[PDB]
């Protein structure tokens with residue numbers, strides 16, 4: 001029952017069972033920075049790009065939250081990582097709302113920024129394109145059905161072209177015990 | 187002087203103290219292939235591109251030579267390596283025939299292919315652009331006068347943005363003793 005839990009149920013009732021939106025901000029300002037730092041150590045470009053996101057993306061306090069911070073708009077939302085799979089945007093964004101499995105909505109203005117600003121930058125630069133291009137012929141057959149590698153064979157499937165990395169647990173205790181001033185001083 | 191050497195002097199007289207031409211075919215057919223193999227092992231891409239040059243470039247027998255083969259047009263000529271310094275072409279090709287030091291002439295039809303088909307592929311891709319981009323600030327002072335690194339400070343000058351490599355002596359004896367079928371067979 002909801003006795004004593006008016007705040008959490010107020011937040012949850014507003015979002016429970018809505019269709020999530022595609023938020024473009026992280027991808028947008030990540031791309032904006034990465035575009036200007038090509039050639040530099042990758043993690044240095046990355047850090048610069050996250051600083052650009054930190055400075056420019058919308059900040060949020062979810063209405064009624066005791067916690068501050070989101071990484072996209074109100075409601076249910078997801079965010080984008082074109083460094084992985086931006087070569088799919090052209091084929092896939094059109095029918096995200098209609099996807100039988102796990103549909104998402106996207107505002108026309110977000111589709112416009114995505115296809116005019118973001119996706120054109122990542123052409124020839126995504127991880128997925130690189131992997132598909134260089135896969136040895138002896139391996140292609142069990143990996144991808146098609147020449148662009150947009151369709152898995154579902155025999156020996158690669159899984160690195162839909163995520164950045166395996167799961168991860170950062171050292172949260174270190175951040176709260178020291179704070180980032182002290183880590184930065186190190 | 188010229189007794190007994192009619193052949194070499196016929197050849198040499200036709201070209202002595204003539205103005206060398208820019209020939210573009212090596213660059214053109216090199217670029218044409220490198221454009222299609224991005225992401226692959228560099229020396230594999232390089233070999234595909236050299237095969238494209240071998241299949242498509244004009245072959246020549248200099249008139250009256252006993253030796254077959256040039257890598258450019260009749261007369262005195264040079265060829266192009268946009269992989270090094272293609273970011274200079276916009277600024278330098280204009281002033282080439284009137285360059286105080288080491289002038290070169292270029293057919294306007296070759297110059298158009300150069301500046302419309304070749305040079306644009308190499309934007310953001312050249313060695314020189316990469317070096318200039320990443321050089322630590324502590325070191326730019328003595329290396330480059332300008333932000334784009336097109337002018338040496340002539341204090342501590344890098345020399346790798348105007349040549350592919352140091353001098354080199356290939357093992358010619360091995361080529362003539364074995365042939366490339368037997369080397370390919372190894």
Ligand SMILES: O=S(=O)(O)C[C@@H](O)CO
Pocket residue numbers: 165166167
């Ligand atoms: O270990 S991973 O392959 O990164 C993910 C798995 O733990 C969750 O699906």
Ligand SMILES: O=S(=O)(O)C[C@@H](O)CO
Pocket residue numbers: 351352353
């Ligand atoms: O050794 S290098 O610096 O490649 C060239 C020098 O031999 C002068 O041509």
